[PDB]
A paper describes a structure:
In the case of ACIII, oligomeric structures were visible in the absence of ATP, and they all formed double-ring structures. ACIII assembled as eight-subunit double rings without ATP-Mg²+, and AFCB formed 7-subunit double rings. The 2D classification of particles of the four ACs revealed that whereas ACI and AFCB formed heptameric rings, ACII and ACIII assembled into octameric rings, mirroring their modern counterparts. Regarding their overall structure, a typical chaperonin double-ring structure was observed for ACIII and AFCB. By contrast, ACIII and AFCB did not require ATP for either assembly or stability. The remaining chaperonins E. coli GroEL, ACI and ACIII exhibited similar hydrolysis patterns. This pattern supports a timeline where ACI is the oldest ancestor, followed by ACII and then ACIII—with the latter likely arising through horizontal gene transfer between an ancestral archaeon and a Firmicutes bacterium rather than being a direct descendent from LUCA. For Group III ancestors, a notable increase in total stability appears to be driven by strengthened Van der Waals forces and reduced backbone clashes, indicating enhanced hydrophobic packing.
All chaperonin monomers share a common three-domain structure: an apical domain involved in substrate recognition, an equatorial domain containing the ATP-binding site that drives the conformational changes that occur during the chaperonin functional cycle, and an intermediate domain linking the two by relaying signals. Using ancestral sequence reconstruction (ASR) and protein resurrection, we inferred and experimentally characterized the last common ancestors of these groups (ancestral chaperonins ACI, ACII, and ACIII). We selected several AC nodes for protein synthesis and purification, including the last common ancestors of Group I (ACI), Group II (ACII), and Group III (ACIII), along with the ancestor of the Fibrobacteres–Chlorobi–Bacteroidetes (FCB) Group (AFCB).
Numbering used by the authors:
A (entry chain N), B (entry chain E), C (entry chain O), D (entry chain F): 12 to 200, 356 to 507
């Protein structure tokens, strides 16, 4: 019986290691990682899609988390860091509950329903955007642009150049229509992203792709309050369902409720504030009945996220949460480790 | 800085060790404790008063807890076990919150307000007695008599002889009017408590005092749905206070919210049941708007505590929680250890 | 003499180890197992057919168990995991009896007679299916298809198309008449099973044959209550046998009696409930004289097996118990281990 | 949690060691025990009272068992060995069930109900004696007299001298009226028991009192098939009850059912036969439905105990089983050890 738990705990540590490396890059004030080789080259990066693509993974269970994370990229092309962090948080809280005495099978079925209601509420709370002239598209473009307005303006201009129904096509991907060249300017003709030298093209094309996918998802799925505020808004209701669920199976719902707060906690931690008090003081304005406010990362004061302009696409967070729940369930479902024939 | 926390942990572990050796006697299906000497004498007792009286204490933090608990006993003559267990839980999760990074003063000042609202709501939940012929006095005598009916009837029979307005006299302690003699019968004259042999006189005398004090308090303060149900009922509202309180300080209100679960948790655990599943399944019937429901100690089925016939006095629980809060606040405040002259 | 028993004990622990690896996959809420290579590839599988194919078996006592398990798979293509988890229980209880002082040769014939009367009573308890219009066909198809109704419907829709006497042909195998192709829909023309991608065909083709074999076995041998309830039912009759067998040899009949409870015990354990408490109350529900009372696998309350709708074919369990008896007999007779040229 | 169980295991081993030190003296072919000192003085004896009154006890769990076992002697004056061995078996099986996962409080109440049930069936099964000249009164004195008829005959000769109603009172016991003097012949004047030398007076007086108590009990409450047959008779009924108890509580009832077989197991083991086979062929002979079959101590052939004459009085066995159940419960309750002032 201890060996079965040790099998799960060994897999959990592999997942937590992947989340540990990529959870420091969350939010608008994230931190970058160092990637080194035996030959000695360096790759400074803060975009998690590059971190997961260019990380040495040897433990068998870690590969599944990256597989789902890049499946999300195949879907819409953004939000892999959030999915990895949520999956790590879910698995960590699940193993914490199992160590408390809950059987793993009960935690899995609790986690399933918790993620189900969380997706339901995130879908409900997503507010649609009225036309491409709305400033919320500028807001969601700037945040995907790493707070560089020069790239941000040319993607939103291109979006209004194309149109609404042409953007609604599911067979068309805007990320295939972005190209970056060196020594050029920023304009739309297929858009051209200017770069200084050849080495600057690689990251500029990446951020152009990210902004393209953000504005792509914004029109179809609407708008959700970013910065982890939506996660807290759904976490409160998931806790209500945890009080609603009967039996030992509820403690998976509590695990989903706690795991949903990890994005906001890591955003405030990366912003250079103490998470445990900034999470406490954030609950003051959540008593007012409005569930669209969080914390800004520059002054540490509680402010509503519509006015602050910290916005996230609805499909990115919805799919990130779905993938995180699916992989957390899949990695919790393992009980034994065996060597092949 | 670690030395200031190290001194807190040693104070905590002394308090915890007192509670771990007393908490097993809580509830109707409690278990006894064996006490040994260098001479090897045996003292089998399940009453917390005697175990706390005769137990060796060397760590100064432990002495304060039993001084507070026995002053509580000097007040009304019962409830020391519940107070000690509650103090242990409060101190344990006080240090648990500090381990997470919360400052100690914030936890202290959160414990203060949590205990304040818990006392207020336990006062408001206490239901008064409608005359002394009410069967709930039979119930509160029966639980105080270790579920032995021969002691349960004579204390209520004597009490109805005394009356009411003579019973509310604060200078009158009814537990001083009990005397047990070997080989006698059961009657009032002074309630004469029969016993088989001389050695049996001590435990019967102690049980007579316990039942006498229970019925004494039942008229003064009314009744509360016991078995840990009332502490759960006020724990829910203390959790609402925690969601109402601002800043880092709210983590102490959460500590009070959890510490009120420990009596019911350890009542269920001592019954031979899994406390996790039974605490999970007990929140179902609390959604109906009623807050007077608990769990039985024989079948494991969730039943209403008024009809289940398990009731405890109001002042005993009130003052036990007050003493537990006061001693938790007094013991979390210490930060350093120095030798004297 | 110690060497003879030690040479047996090393054989038992091999059958125990291979049984332990697949015991977690039993039941509708089973847990998957990952199979790592030297090169690091992984196969997540919850079916017991594949885990035995793709695992090292170096201690040759396990080779006999895998050989007889796949030999069992050859007739009716299902229930190999039940066969090996019953074999492990029988062998473990037999060696436990041998530890008490019973010689092995007595336990061998006790096992023989107990398994014989267990086969007799599990055959008798089987209830024939009323045509192909009976919804028990849907019930037995859904369970074999991992509780996925989309694949469950097509197998029984085809089975309607084949007929009664054409399915009753012993030389005709309907598991060869199921084929899976990627990118297609589900229809019967040959049963075509749809799949998303090429990698999804590998598992869909497997579960198609499993579901096909379930409905094939159902017509031949009728229906038996699943979830381990039938093994619990025949266990009591084996216990009644044990009191009738004269001499030291009966204790093998006790080994059969205790081993037949292992399926229900492990299905309950994998479900996330306590096996002892949830198996004790089952026999308390057997007072009515009916032998179908089993346990639901998400609420944990005892429920009559037929009405829950989770039901398993009769011949698969018949031959699984026969194979478990054959291998438990075969392994126990091995007393010495030596080498060749 | 481990310490609470380890505190029980040290208490269990003390009881087991006491029972293990007097288990070989049970039955008509019992084996003596050698006591030693620092001075080297030694006493050879097989009367368990003379061992338990003299062997050294330092673990306080053993002193309670000897206290209640000698209280049984104070009540009647015989059957202390069976009380001790039953207490040991009950405690050993209680801890065996706690090892599996049953909480101690559940086993405790299961044991309580099992012992109450066993007392009820022994009360029913104990048939009365028809007059004083019935040969079973000769037989009970014979077994009480270490299979020597010289002491047995004078006891029944005195018993007819006193009278039936004179024996019926509780205020008078003829265990005190027996007196042994050296150099005297066997006659009654005061039952004068002859002895060879002064040293022979001690054990002869002791066995005279034992035989006196045996025939006291025989008229007082009748007779019960001894040699362990009656405990096997009631153990089947306790096993039948075990299947009716709901939930986790039953495993105490199974412990009571098993612990009642330890008496006959030890009579057979001390006799020089394999207990496991001679229990199987005994329970295989109970097909007729009668509850008087046992095993003879000279040939090992299964015979009815009435014809063999091996008989034991009813009240001694009833009180021994009651004391064994009470002490097993009271030693199972203990879960924590502390040093006192």
């Amino acid at each position: 019986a201890d060996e079965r738990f040790q099998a799960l705990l060994t897999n959990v540590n592999a997942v937590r290691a992947i989340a540990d490396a990529v959870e420091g890059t969350l939010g608008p004030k994230g931190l970058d990682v160092m990637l080194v080789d035996k030959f000695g080259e360096v790759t400074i990066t803060n975009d998690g899609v590059t971190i997961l693509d260019q990380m040495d993974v040897q433990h068998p269970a870690a590969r599944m988390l990256i597989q789902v994370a890049r499946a999300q990229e195949e879907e819409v092309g953004d939000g892999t860091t959030t999915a990895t962090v949520l999956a790590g948080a879910l698995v960590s809280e699940g193993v914490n509950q199992v160590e408390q005495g809950v059987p793993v099978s009960r935690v899995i079925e609790g986690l399933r329903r918790g993620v189900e209601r969380a997706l339901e509420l995130l879908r409900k709370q997503a507010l649609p955007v009225e036309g491409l002239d709305d400033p919320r598209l500028r807001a969601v473009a700037r945040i995907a642009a790493r707070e560089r307005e020069d790239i941000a303006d040319l993607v939103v201009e291109a979006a209004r150049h194309i149109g609404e129904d042409k953007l609604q096509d599911p067979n068309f991907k805007l990320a295939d229509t972005v190209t970056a060249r060196e020594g050029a300017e920023n304009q739309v003709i297929t858009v051209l992203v200017g770069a200084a030298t050849e080495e600057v093209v690689g990251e500029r094309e990446r951020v152009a792709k990210d902004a393209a996918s953000a504005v792509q998802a914004a029109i179809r799925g609407g708008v959700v309050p970013g910065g982890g505020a939506a996660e807290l808004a759904v976490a409160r209701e998931v806790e209500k369902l945890a009080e609603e669920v009967k039996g030992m199976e509820r403690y998976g719902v509590e695990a989903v409720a706690e795991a949903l707060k990890k994005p906001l906690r890591q955003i405030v931690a990366n912003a250079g504030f103490n998470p445990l008090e900034k999470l406490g003081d954030l609950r003051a304005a959540h008593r007012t009945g409005n569930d669209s406010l969080g914390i800004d990362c520059d002054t540490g004061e509680v402010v509503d996220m519509w006015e602050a302009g910290v916005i996230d696409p609805a499909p990115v967070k919805l799919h990130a949460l779905k993938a995180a729940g699916e992989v957390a369930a899949a990695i919790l479902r393992i009980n034994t480790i065996i060597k092949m024939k």
